[PDB]
Write an enzyme that holds these catalytic residues in place. Sequence first.
Site, PDB file in Angstrom:
ATOM      1  N   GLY B 342      11.566  28.744  -3.211  1.00 29.89           N
ATOM      2  CA  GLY B 342      13.204  28.306  -4.215  1.00 29.89           C
ATOM      3  C   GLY B 342      14.140  28.842  -3.574  1.00 29.89           C
ATOM      4  N   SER B 366      13.292  25.992  -7.970  1.00 30.77           N
ATOM      5  CA  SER B 366      12.198  26.918  -7.533  1.00 30.77           C
ATOM      6  C   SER B 366      11.345  26.238  -7.709  1.00 30.77           C
ATOM      7  N   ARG B 367      10.812  26.506  -6.323  1.00 31.33           N
ATOM      8  CA  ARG B 367       9.722  25.808  -6.124  1.00 31.33           C
ATOM      9  C   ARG B 367       7.876  27.116  -6.256  1.00 31.33           C
ATOM     10  N   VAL B 368       8.506  27.561  -6.920  1.00 25.10           N
ATOM     11  CA  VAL B 368       6.800  28.179  -8.034  1.00 25.10           C
ATOM     12  C   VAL B 368       7.679  28.680  -9.392  1.00 25.10           C
ATOM     13  N   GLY B 369       8.461  28.346  -9.774  1.00 23.10           N
ATOM     14  CA  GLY B 369       9.617  29.021 -11.337  1.00 23.10           C
ATOM     15  C   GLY B 369       8.893  28.733 -12.176  1.00 23.10           C
TER      16      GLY B 369
END
Lengths: 50, 499, 468, 62, 56
Positions: B342, B366-369
């Site tokens: 993110g 956000s890559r895991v948000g």
Amino acid sequence: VRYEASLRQLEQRQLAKSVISRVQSELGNPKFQEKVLQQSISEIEQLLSK
Amino acid sequence: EVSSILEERIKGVSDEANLNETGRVLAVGDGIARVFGLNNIQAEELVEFSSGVKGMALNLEPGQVGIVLFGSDRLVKEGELVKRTGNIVDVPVGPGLLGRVVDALGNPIDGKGPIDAAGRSRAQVKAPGILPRRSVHEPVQTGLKAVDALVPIGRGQRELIIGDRQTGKTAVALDTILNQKRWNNGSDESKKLYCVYVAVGQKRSTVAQLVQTLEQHDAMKYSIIVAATASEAAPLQYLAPFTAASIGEWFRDNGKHALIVYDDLSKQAVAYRQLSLLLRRPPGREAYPGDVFYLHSRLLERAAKLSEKEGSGSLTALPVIETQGGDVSAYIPTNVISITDGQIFLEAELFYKGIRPAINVGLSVSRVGSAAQVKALKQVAGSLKLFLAQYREVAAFAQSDLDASTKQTLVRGERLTQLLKQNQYSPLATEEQVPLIYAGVNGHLDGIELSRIGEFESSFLSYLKSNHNELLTEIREKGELSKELLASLKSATESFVAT
Amino acid sequence: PITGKVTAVIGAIVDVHFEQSELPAILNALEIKTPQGKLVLEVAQHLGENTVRTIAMDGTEGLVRGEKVLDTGGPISVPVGRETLGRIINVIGEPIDERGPIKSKLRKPIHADPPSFAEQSTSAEILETGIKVVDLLAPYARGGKIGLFGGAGVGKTVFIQELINNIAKAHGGFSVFTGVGERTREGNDLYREMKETGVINLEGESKVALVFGQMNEPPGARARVALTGLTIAEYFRDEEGQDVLLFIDNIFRFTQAGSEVSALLGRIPSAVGYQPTLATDMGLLQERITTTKKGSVTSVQAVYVPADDLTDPAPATTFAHLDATTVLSRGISELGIYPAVDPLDSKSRLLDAAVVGQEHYDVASKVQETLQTYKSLQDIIAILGMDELSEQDKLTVERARKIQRFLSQPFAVAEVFTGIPGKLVRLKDTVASFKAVLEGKYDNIPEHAFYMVGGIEDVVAKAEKLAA
Amino acid sequence: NVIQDLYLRELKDTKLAPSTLQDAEGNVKPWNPPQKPNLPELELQGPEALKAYTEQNVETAH
Amino acid sequence: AKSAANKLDWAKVISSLRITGSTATQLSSFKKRNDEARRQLLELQSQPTEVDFSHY
């Protein structure tokens, strides 16, 4: 309260100059020699404890 | 008085200990000293010179050991006696560091007495394995709606805040700490965050303003500040994030949830660059040393949402990168981007054009948000990221797109942008954010003329609380909207909007 | 007595081999007696084996390798005191104004670590400026660093002179004008001008102390000149509890001097050729500039961008330290405005609402918005015609063109120079002036009856004169 | 040993005496006195106003 | 209380909306609202009158 804290700090730096006065006292005295003898025997005791 | 107590302490110091070995310094300068002896030295030990300065042995070479001075050259002198501390570089860790400013060595620069610390723990410590990790699920609520919808952040989550210099870069993080003041003024340990603010490469004056700001918002009592100011020596700056993370890991390894904001790792890079050059190690790409990727990666990966088996640990990470006039292509930024999951890129143009906070939504990901994101804030957040990337597209070609469909989107988009804006250092409650997003998403904000949107927000919120804070309490606990809650909110929103 | 024989003179990097158990320390000062009087070398390394590597503070025109050296014992100690006010002093700390021994009482080391975390003030404060333009759009902050941009002569130097006068009235503090890489001809003119504008009164008392670091100085002496000036300032702040204002000339030339010294020391120059120690050297310099409990230094620095490339590391490093920026422009000065400050490029980081007062902030924001809209508005208004100025538009134009003139304040140093009696408009009256123009109370007084006059009170007079 | 000598000697032989309260007054902000009951307020005073307002109005104007 | 003041303020607006119901009656309402809103934030602002000679 602010001036009280300031006065405590002022006391500490004044007593710092009292350390300076004592440094001049030790290095004058042949306590400079005589307490070195004490240090010598203390190291003898220390090194004997090995 | 206090002087008598100090003198009692002075009486209370007097060693007689034998020195296992000393060294004598050879050629010295360039913040490294070359010492003769130290043959029984451990690697990465801490040595203390007879100038009282301490340094970390880096290069253990046949017949010489080369200390790196954590401290000024002026103090160290040629042919001086270097005494082995005998310990690998460790820093005090414990529960008593909360509400204490400390420098990197752990000296109390707050001066609220000698630090209360349970243990000391090695400055570099390996990151927990694959098996120790567990996927994130708990949220961190920043109090900035964009940074809670457009970028949701969670506990133990690695994330990145990148953008242009002193755009109140710091303020974005401060607001997170402030928002979580009510969660941390909670009694639930799980919802307590113990937040560490690492100030690296910052003016000692600026840090003093920060401390005062935090103590004005009385947030200091749940937070630690570690300081490695610009004046503080470059090796001290180099070890400064690592040391801060150790303190954080003690909380993490208490299972306790925490956050550590590293402002600014870009300054750690410059420090490591300085160190590397002064170690005469060949310059890397962009003249930043070749191990700069390794440096950042080792630092960053010590933040984790540990698995329930291994403690349920959390230590959220927000590292603040100072881009030189933007352009995310740039070796130091790209290296960081790759490590982090993110980004929260901030746009100068938008900042200038009065969007505070200036959260670029083109370059914020956000890559895991979404795992962290609360169900309430999934439901109400009806692909708002998509919608405002339809606004982004629409206004791209607006200056053509005269289609009423595009215009409807533009009217929504511009108005939605108004909702995003938040007066910094006044963060909104999560419960309160849920209706605002409902309103805008469900397009009841077209019913508000653009100029009066700010009025609408406050008034809408006041209306809702007065009309029925029962709804707001319900979503506060449920964290989901039932069909009834959703309808009740739709109905209520229609009621205020109309009025 | 620590003495040693010169064992190298490669460039201005002189290695001295010292007798056993008589070893200098890092940052000490060595004096080699020369037919040039003395040469001051500063120990910047120990190469081991009772040898050092030093930098020079005077151009080394040859020494005999084996010349005896005497070690002063520590970083150069320069005289400080109220005596040193109004004295031009070279880097080593000896008069170049040739008014004989300036030694007030004490001399002090040129290096000196930044004040502690405890010493730092916890809350921002404002430094008063007689310049009204400054006090609205970028009010000076005591403790802070305010980085000048713009012209020279009629540009910067007069601006600098103005500030000295203002400080003397405003606070009654001190100043030290430190000029780094200064063309000695230009320096001579400045000394004479400073005498003329009486900030240095040779017979009288002097405010500004001068430290001149000429272009013909060796790079090492260029590097330490700044730190010397800083020491002078610190004596005033710490040991006389007064506010000071420390001018620096190009801090670009601080960088340039520093970059050379690194390279000379043999250190690998970092990106864009700048010092590997680039950050730390600025850090030391710019963390001794602060508001202590005793007093506060405030520093106006001159930043000459390298090709306007803000992205270059040297401006960037400077900007990190800077707190406010004053962006004088000569185009603006050519619009007849003295001060020459470009208002839309005038910015402070303590232009913050809380800091300057909410009321002050609101007034400032309005004036900024007014000017901003006016400037843009004039772009197409000029092309389209003034007939396009609506009632709303001309409300802004009338106020704006009146504000534009209202900025023009003749000031005391240039009372002679413009020929128009000076005005030192204090901050409270600055708020008042803009409040009224915003409320259009004095929007009924002609545009040029705000030209070249000070505060709100002043334009009452000017209104009378316009009629007269 | 030498520590003891320095400590002992210093503590005993050097004792500062604080300044007077009068000297303190300059360095502190001293007690500000009571604010007084100021003056009470009498609004719409005199029956001049009352008769005037009743008489003057006889129609509601916008 | 405060609710009396604001109800009459907005009531007088809707009376003047019809055949005029205020000129300066509504101005009286506006004025009482101003200072009434000032006194409540004053009253919540109120310093504790006791000097903390316990702690300080």
